[model samples]
Target: YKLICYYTSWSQYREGDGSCFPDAIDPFLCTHVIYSFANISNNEIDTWEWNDVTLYDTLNTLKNRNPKLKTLLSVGGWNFGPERFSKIASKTQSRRTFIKSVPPFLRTHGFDGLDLAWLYPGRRDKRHLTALVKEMKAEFAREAQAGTERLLLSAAVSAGKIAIDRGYDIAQISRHLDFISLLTYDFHGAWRQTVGHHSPLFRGNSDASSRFSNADYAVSYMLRLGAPANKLVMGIPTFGRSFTLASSKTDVGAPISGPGIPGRFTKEKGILAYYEICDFLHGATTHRFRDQQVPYATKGNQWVAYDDQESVKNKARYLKNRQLAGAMVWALDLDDFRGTFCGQNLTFPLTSAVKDVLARV
Candidate 1:
């Protein structure tokens, strides 16, 4: 199984600023790099404009810099909004047109495949979601038959039940896609009004609800729903979630607040650039959570929840036990380059830790 690192458009690397990529280059660790959505509109799908040219240039540069890197274009992100997706996916002809245009885009950009990141397909109607995927699969199969060089098709799906039940026909769609990227993080956060585990095997006492707050439950549910174990890629948050504590002490069950505070570096409100957090980890305090097998820290009133080497080791072992494809990090930019958070650099921790566990498996 191969590990994939998803690179979003707004990351430091995309902005031409210094990033973790320069310091962290391990081909053996992560073989694929999925550059996020080109944001191709339905009308502009066939043309090569300046924006598209720039995107291709950036991709070409990244690929050339890392000879072993395999790149893919991820379409539809969280903020892409639902309106456009409905417009494109609602009709069979539009869906077919979109699929037909994908190959040329891949070829022009010199990418390996496509990653569909539709936020939620079934939010409006299951019928529309099913039809959209079916049309996509048919077009993809048609392209494959016409000999377009095995283009990989994958999707980043939400772990919530609403998404699970209505968003997709997993079993049917899995047959068409190379794999499904299950976003397992962001289960709990300050939004819950209580401090709880962000990505845990079990929810804390403070959790208002016991469901959808853990990695094990989410991944297991997918497996039960008939998504093949080998075709599932578990998502790991490169950063953590935090809450502002009222007192110096906090525990699983303790609560008395209106939505615990969100973390700055973690996946809450502000997107903390990876290199910035790496610098902060130098003097930051760190502690481990026994049951969750993860680590976190707090500076003054601000609480930072994030994974450490131990937590990743445990998660990797869990994936191996289930015989899943491997883990996928949300973005590679958030890691302590100084080796404070995870012994070595953060990416090293992520990739090397998985390699160690997978080797044992």
Candidate 2:
């Protein structure tokens, strides 16, 4: 089982020092470190100017420090969306150009591979996704065949039925890539008009009307679409969602307002980021939803929901039972690193806990 630690541009490392490498966070048990969004253009790759020196220097230091660490550049994300992808993936020339550019860019940057994160490749436009992937894979294979350093190829896939129905042919895509990451979180969120579990095992009190709530539905849906279990990686969210409590008597229901409900930290009355929510959890109330295997809290009229180690453990068991690849967490910094959110000592680091549980498979 391989653990891939993902760092976003909005993280503390990126904000304070403008550095991508989290030197404070060591890669102890993990196998890979995936840095998101390496944008390509005109057959050349754009370097992270601010962090390039620090990042490469750190990668070199880590090579000497930990030989097991393999770093990858993840391209495209939710914000990048489907429109830009239509332009880039439309032509064979664009595809070929991107493939030609990536290796030299990675070689220069000291990266090991690439992770494609184009959200909803075929969902919005079914025009050229298969061709784009086929071309990209062929280019990757060509480079590998010519003895350009062996590169890892993985993709972050959508978990919703839209992905299963309108997304790329999973089995065919899986055959080309090393692994596929199924975003298992965000199954339920404030995006929906109603309150529901962010990542649930069973429908919570809020989601009594929805058909499926367990991770099984998400995982099984993919398997039914012909995705190989061993190559399937489950995506977990480090954070959770919040909703405005309608009443004390009302356990959980549709928010009277729309999505992006306020949290304790944000003064503007919008959704709170994970770290902010974790910080607020100190004095906030706590309760467990046993069926959902997640924790919730309420401070005054505001409701906060999130996952814990025990919830992670239960999901890990499900992953093992399904014989799936190891879990991939959304971000690492959300965990209570120093006994902050949950008061107990952590048995293992976030990545290691998933690895340890998957080891049982």
Residue range 1-361, candidate 1, lDDT tens digits? 6688775544433333333332344444576778765675753353223355565556556666668777778877877776677778777777777778877777776888888887767656556756766666666666777666667778888877656886677777777778888888766644555555577755443436656667888888899888999999988776665556666666554352443343343434423433444444667777667766677665665556677666777888888888999888777656543345444434455556666776785
Candidate 1 lDDT at 53 equals 58
Off by over 4 Å in 1: 13-26, 43-52, 58-69, 145-148, 203-208, 247-249, 253-285, 336-347
Quantify all predictions' global Cα lDDT against the true fold.
0.66, 0.66
lDDT by residue (1-361, candidate 2, tens digit) is 7566676543544333222245544666457767766665563456544665465556545656787788888888765656677777776677667777887777777888888888776654554766766666777777777667677788888777665678678767877788888787766644565555667765554444554545768788889878889889887666667676655532455353544355433333535545556566777888787767777776766676677666777877877778887778776544433333344455224545666776775
Show the colliding residue pairs in model 1: 193-259
In model 2, the clashing pairs are: none
Model 2 CA deviation exceeding 4 Å by range: 13-21, 203-209, 212-214, 246-250, 254-278, 337-349, 359-361
lDDT of 1: 0.66
Highest TM-score among the candidates is held by which one? Answer: 2
